[PDB]
DNA sequence: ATTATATTAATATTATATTTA
RNA sequence: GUUGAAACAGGGUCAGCUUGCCGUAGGUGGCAUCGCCCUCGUC
């Protein structure tokens, strides 16, 4: 319940960065304070801001791949928990870094999307 | 600089159209989900006031905050290259630039703006601060879907025959949006909000629904404006009961409301005659 | 990864919004601004205001499809989702606010598949 | 997944529109533009303007059916739905606006079934 | 689910049309085109043009019935409905347009029952 | 003391008479 | 029964004294449900 939430936050920040290159006050710098603790409060609005970021993308195929991978991420989460325990916040951070480095790899997200 | 407190009870409705649309919901006005009362943000009234000032002024010392072709960073850089270019030691330089912009701009003087971009120059707390409007009777959404006999883009949706692009144009039958707002004096003394600017703001709030019109918003008008002028800068009575004295409920045995002949604006100025005043500008 | 017997209001609401977005995307591939780019901003908070226009535009979106059986399958899964949706609430709770997006992306993943929706429709 | 004793105006209104659409679809399989592609756009807001023409066209749609007992069953369920509909309102509330589509898709799911509508009609 | 003391013109008009259709259906089971397949298209808008021929054809429909007491009960309920109908209007309002079909289907449901119409007739 | 940046999937649910002293 | 025996982690300590998420901003430019149809053939 925490690792997939971290991957979710990571792909959300990646989509927001691909939307706005010169980002100053990212969704991270304003939401990660409670995303690691209260998921239903932050993700209740990040999932709202996400389709606008996907529509902002100049490459529609990139937004398609990001939507598919966030679907694969949220598939493992049956429900957003009320609060992430101390180990759940660590899992959140670990999944965040893992996904944010898997998306910044050479040909990883495209190869994963092509195998579906 | 003003010295009195003003608690105006702005009342405005909508004949047929979409007033304050979209809290990200497509093209529908903001309505209460639990009940059904229509809600109107204060930024719409602020933009109407700005448009009224832009069309009824055209002078200096009262900047109107330009529309699409107005980068805030460019305006901040232009306002920085005036009297405090660099010889002011950053700290008080920001306050000096803020005071200069308050003396030059009218939107930041009455309401406020963000001046903390690249070249920071502080921020304005703002004296006059309007609130979000809210109607009394649960309004209903009409949703007047209309069509068009001309396609926009050359995508695959453009058929060989009738190049049509329909959509929806939401409308509202009625809904007296009981707006609220309070005016302070401490921030007005710093921003330079004089009594002339207050009178101009009142005139704008009164006569903004006669020029700022469009096809989506339709026809909108302002009912009444009961300003509660105080006597000092202290707090006499809570503003809750003060704004509750001017209640707006249903009239006789009617289900909904269509115009002003179905509402009964109960105005009983009896207990507000201690150390406060009352004036009528729109109604 | 989708629970169709959760009996949660947010789950079925999100699944309904997901199948609506899928239908709008299938209606025309060259779509710039979909419903998710405007309707989803208040779908989990004020569902009774967006889902009305959604159900109003659903039949036209189904008729816009080049295949009529696809629209039949989509309506079938819409109703299979809304089975557990006894009523459209005024506002969703925080847990329901999260379950909205949960069911939304779960149904989107279940729909964007090779043989899954048609396989479930065949056993009906 | 259908509550026939909810005593809600939107529920019965949606169920009535759903059975009307089902009757129109059963009248001819090769139907391009049904009532849902035009009548549903204002059915939950101005029901007194669309449901009048709906009830006017209902007997002709029932006569268009190849089976006369099917029309009898459809009218029976129409009246069983409208039992709780004491009057056609002018405009539905937001909660009623959502309950409209709720009952619509619930009745559509209940109708598009193997043995359900006929089973309920047999116990009458 | 029927209000006989609503004092609404559309309600009693719809109930009268419903009992007329019931009488025409009871006159002959092998009926192809009833009055609802032609008269209902303008019954809620121009009632003074259709209900005249309806009342003209009502006695022949009652005489066509195999049972004379059934016609007596049907006329009794017709008059119990028309009690609140002080006059036949020129055109019905939108609210009355909806109340027409409301009362129509309500009276149809009340008539197509086991022990209800005869039970109400016994207390008269 | 960065990265990366182009489209998943789509062909029919259902469909046979309440009630009539 | 003559060959490693005995073994304190302690007595016990407020992690605070606290701090405005904000200053604040138009879903918009606006778009014909239409171009159309004998209630009939008639007893």
mmCIF file of C-alpha atoms (C1' of nucleotides) in Angstrom, chain B residues 22 27 30 46 50 67 123-125 129 147-149 164 214, chain G residues 20 22-35:
data_model
loop_
_atom_site.group_PDB
_atom_site.id
_atom_site.type_symbol
_atom_site.label_atom_id
_atom_site.label_comp_id
_atom_site.label_asym_id
_atom_site.label_seq_id
_atom_site.Cartn_x
_atom_site.Cartn_y
_atom_site.Cartn_z
ATOM 1 C CA UNK B 22 -16.482 25.647 -13.738
ATOM 2 C CA UNK B 27 -19.062 24.267 -18.324
ATOM 3 C CA UNK B 30 -20.560 26.348 -9.214
ATOM 4 C CA UNK B 46 -13.022 41.608 -9.433
ATOM 5 C CA UNK B 50 -11.246 45.815 -13.574
ATOM 6 C CA UNK B 67 -5.182 41.185 -20.219
ATOM 7 C CA UNK B 123 3.307 41.308 -1.324
ATOM 8 C CA UNK B 124 0.147 43.307 -0.624
ATOM 9 C CA UNK B 125 -2.227 42.037 2.056
ATOM 10 C CA UNK B 129 -11.395 41.358 0.271
ATOM 11 C CA UNK B 147 -24.929 23.291 -32.221
ATOM 12 C CA UNK B 148 -22.681 24.835 -34.865
ATOM 13 C CA UNK B 149 -22.770 24.439 -38.654
ATOM 14 C CA UNK B 164 -20.931 20.228 -37.283
ATOM 15 C CA UNK B 214 -21.046 37.929 -23.093
ATOM 16 C "C1'" G G 20 -1.009 32.892 9.198
ATOM 17 C "C1'" C G 22 -0.384 32.001 2.025
ATOM 18 C "C1'" G G 23 -0.597 36.845 -0.049
ATOM 19 C "C1'" U G 24 -4.643 35.792 -5.352
ATOM 20 C "C1'" A G 25 -6.231 35.036 -9.957
ATOM 21 C "C1'" G G 26 -12.719 35.749 -15.850
ATOM 22 C "C1'" G G 27 -13.511 28.650 -18.456
ATOM 23 C "C1'" U G 28 -12.685 31.428 -21.570
ATOM 24 C "C1'" G G 29 -13.333 33.822 -27.755
ATOM 25 C "C1'" G G 30 -18.913 31.549 -29.282
ATOM 26 C "C1'" C G 31 -21.409 27.898 -31.860
ATOM 27 C "C1'" A G 32 -28.974 27.925 -36.271
ATOM 28 C "C1'" U G 33 -31.201 21.080 -34.108
ATOM 29 C "C1'" C G 34 -30.927 21.817 -38.338
ATOM 30 C "C1'" G G 35 -31.649 21.649 -43.598
#
